[PDB]
Symmetry: C3
Subunit: 393 residues, 3 copies
């Protein structure tokens, strides 16, 4: 576990890069990738039940006044960590210089959709945010039945809450059983990514790869570790517990698919179920510091590859636009590169221009490698804020 | 509540009509309507769970012989109240004269679809009638397990019925919490309708508007109040309890979306859960006296605007066709005007004729204002029949 | 029951064939078929709940070591019975000679899809195999909570398992109530098939009809009865208990739709719920001996009608291809004839050839009559293997 997952990650990238330099990326896509795809299928299987069941129980166990206080805390935390990741990525884009080696030249509906019109349908087809909304309303209604003067109502409410909790506790036991297959699933996914896109990390694409990974490492040290030290949390013991969720996120490149592993990690470190069952699923789609840092670095790569000087006001409007795009990015692999296109239409750089689509295509050739570092930071920011908010209730 | 909802309804129509005469209907569509749309999203959220859970519990608590007796009673009640609404609308269409001011000239698959082939899918995508069918079969099966000679079967059946009831009782507590936002949601929806279509109530369109609302008022007095007095039910105390569901139906213009408010109203007035949990959801799609009265008035408006004399046999075939269209009309806003087109193909007036589509378009310009009075009578007829059937078990 | 279903089957085929020789097949499609379609709607209604609920309970009651042993047993049984059905059909195709009277001339994605990415969605839209996968994982997780050192976890796990079992036991009581309508539903479906396709059983099509039904009768005697005698099971008492599921399968021509009747039959004969709740739903899509025997007979009919000699190596590759097509065939009516086209592309006989499509069309004219005998053997093979595996745990 603590060694076999690291073994599969290291040995898989070695087997991936070796088989990638030869050109057998089509061979690992046939015989190796299905073992990693299966590992993701199992984790995606548990997302909707483990989110809905844990939140009905958690929103009941906690008081609505405290639950709303956690939302105000975790949202202010999410907006600040993402805004810091962009300004850290822009700084990392200027410490390095990606784009100088190549010489080219040139809402209300979303809020209302949080409220589902059919929670049975919401559970049926993904939709974590509508599920989060209905599960909170349900759990809060459950405990208002606990205070009923009627005996039949209290027994029926306790029965439903227990059955729901029985489902929740069941899903967590499945994660511990699925994570036994992680060394094989980790080995397979890291090898497929390193085989297909490991050859593409050359030259200016190797610069933007190092500019992002250094920014992500600095995001963990200068932001997450510092904030954990300020709120009195040992970072080394935190990474030891989050090691399973961080590597699973780095490997599956899906914050939504890693979500059952992160909620187990938060449970395994004693965080109240009324907090992590609400911040982790909401943070799996809103808190994306790794995506916010990646989109800030690449927007500078586009502007530098095209020989355009970005004013301080333009660098400022990039931060506000990337944070908006950081939230709109899905917790699925490759979503950040698609959302990067919307951040380029705001600075007046359309993808219809051939030189814009050229550099954008270059990023796609290494997007999955950058996607690994993105999701791990998108997920760590969810656990870091959950632990800090739970530290202050 | 008893005042704030009336305040939001009155003040909203005032703010709506004032902002409508200026032309700021696009402004209330942007800043005001989302507050009313959100109120409808919350009510639609509770429909499927509150229908399925309450009916499994209600069909278990009641005996199958009594449940089938309620169906025969409530269906005979539904067909008579709708047939009376059309003949009342045709009479109201002749007391007034809409169409003289403008001078122009010229099944088995549905029954089988009540039985769902996947109750999990039925719950996922609307389909109240298939849910009603499965919930009745489930609740009846639950109580047949209560009489099992086995102890494990009785405990497991009581466990499921309690958990289901825990969900039901939970949804009702949500309605009381959502109705706290009704004064804002009522104010928003009445203002958007009065701003967009309040300017259109001029001339012959003001005649058909008064001809319908008088017929709906007469439907409540001469039919509902009389039948409540015959079966020994004080109408004033009935309207006091149904005030929340009647105004919510008048404002949301959706019998299906108002359904969680009407089932709470029926619970708040002591009606057995084995009755209202079956008649109200079935009446939200079959009992539409307000729609049956509206389609009878408008069919005369089409024939009078085109200068065509309707024989007594034609007026008779209109009633039989509108009642058929009254049942096929959905409990969603604007469904009655779409179903009005099918009632015109039967009398030999196709919408391909330009003069037919002209008067039909005129009705669309005031359809939402008429839709408010429709749904309130469609819903009142559900509560009136439920209370009368519960008065006789 | 034991007589009325046989009465409706016999009298329905008589009324079907009589009304079919006149030509009133359109009359029985209008007034008779809806009564049979309704009977299938009710059975399809119970499939998903009775599969999911019974398997969570069954996989919990049984040990995972024994459950995996049943899978290895029932799969080896399924592959052998299907391979024997093809070799029996090819032998039956050579005892008779269909095609001499007419003189003409001329995977990994499937495995990964067993693991659902949303069990709520899987239940919503069919997908028995993903449900089987999640229900087993859930039931196994339930009993791992029974051994928890925590009291709240054991109570919540027992609560969920009971509620789920309460649903399961409920669905079985519905089957016994739906089967009371079987004599009407059986009479209707047998009459519609005999009216539409009874006229088509003439000449060479009557030969292939007798060649299949004799092979299916020999499949029950020489394979099922022999294996039941070897494992010490009285065949006469077995057919008496399976009479309801065998005739329902013969009449509805849907192994998936008959599944709630077969699981009840297996319960009514004392088979452990940890076995039949896993082998019967898995066998309703994988074990299709009647389809495997039908596709073997028809492939010879195509080759004989086109005057092509089939080598022993070709007859061998037909068996391996039909068994592959036997598994891919759905448990819905007419699926075997569609899957027969894929078995013809392997032997190098495309349906683009006019003479190939001619004989293929002839089989479609009698496909539903052959589909009756298919499903009954597809279902009997599920019960036969379940009883034999349960005989040895
Ligand atoms: N891989 C990221 C999304 C992205 O950056 O494309 C996540 O799942 O959070
Ligand atoms: N508004 C009506 C339908 C209609 O008349 O269009 C209802 O919801 O019942
Ligand atoms: N009727 C078969 C399928 C087929 O052979 O077409 C079944 O349901 O198992
Ligand atoms: Na963030
Ligand atoms: Na995230
Ligand atoms: Na995001
Ligand atoms: Na009615
Ligand atoms: Na209604
Ligand atoms: Na209707
Ligand atoms: Na088989
Ligand atoms: Na089968
Ligand atoms: Na099959």
């Amino acid at each position: 576990v603590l060694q076999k997952i690291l073994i599969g990650l290291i040995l898989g990238a070695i087997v991936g890069l070796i088989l990638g330099h030869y050109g057998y990326a089509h061979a690992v896509h046939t015989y190796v990738k299905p073992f990693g795809d299966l590992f993701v299928r199992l984790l995606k299987m548990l997302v909707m039940p483990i989110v809905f069941a844990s939140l009905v129980v958690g929103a009941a166990s906690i008081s609505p006044a405290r639950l709303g206080r956690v939302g105000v805390k975790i949202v202010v935390y999410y907006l600040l960590t993402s805004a810091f990741a962009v300004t850290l990525g822009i700084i990392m884009a200027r410490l390095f210089n990606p784009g100088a080696g190549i010489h080219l030249a040139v809402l209300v509906h979303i809020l209302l959709d949080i409220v589902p019109t059919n929670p049975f349908g919401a559970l049926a087809n993904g939709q974590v945010l509508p599920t989060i909304f209905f599960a909170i309303i349900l759990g809060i209604a459950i405990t208002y039945l606990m205070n009923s003067e009627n005996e039949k109502v209290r027994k029926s409410a306790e029965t439903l809450l227990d059955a729901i909790n029985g489902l929740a506790e069941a899903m967590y036991k499945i994660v511990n059983g699925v994570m036994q297959l992680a060394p094989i699933g980790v080995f397979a996914l890291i090898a497929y990514v390193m085989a297909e896109q490991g050859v593409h990390v050359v030259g200016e694409l190797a610069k933007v790869t190092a500019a992002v990974y250094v920014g992500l490492t600095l995001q963990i040290l200068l932001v997450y570790f510092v904030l954990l030290k300020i709120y009195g949390i040992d970072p080394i013991s935190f990474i030891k517990h989050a090691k399973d969720a961080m590597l699973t996120a780095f490997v599956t490149r899906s914050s939504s698919g890693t979500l059952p592993v992160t909620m187990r990690v938060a449970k395994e470190m004693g965080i109240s179920e009324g907090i992590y069952s609400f911040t982790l699923p909401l943070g799996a789609t809103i808190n994306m510091d790794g995506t916010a840092l990646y989109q800030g670095v690449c927007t500078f790569f586009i502007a530098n590859a095209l020989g355009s000087h970005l004013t301080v006001g333009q660098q400022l409007t990039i931060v506000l636009t990337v944070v908006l795009a950081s939230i709109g990015t899905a917790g699925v692999p490759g979503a950040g590169a698609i959302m990067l296109a919307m951040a380029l239409h705001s600075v007046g750089l359309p993808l219809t221009d051939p030189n814009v689509a050229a550099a954008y295509a270059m990023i796609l050739g290494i997007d999955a490698i950058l996607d690994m570092g993105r999701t791990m930071v998108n997920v760590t920011g969810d656990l870091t804020g959950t632990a800090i908010v739970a530290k202050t209730e």
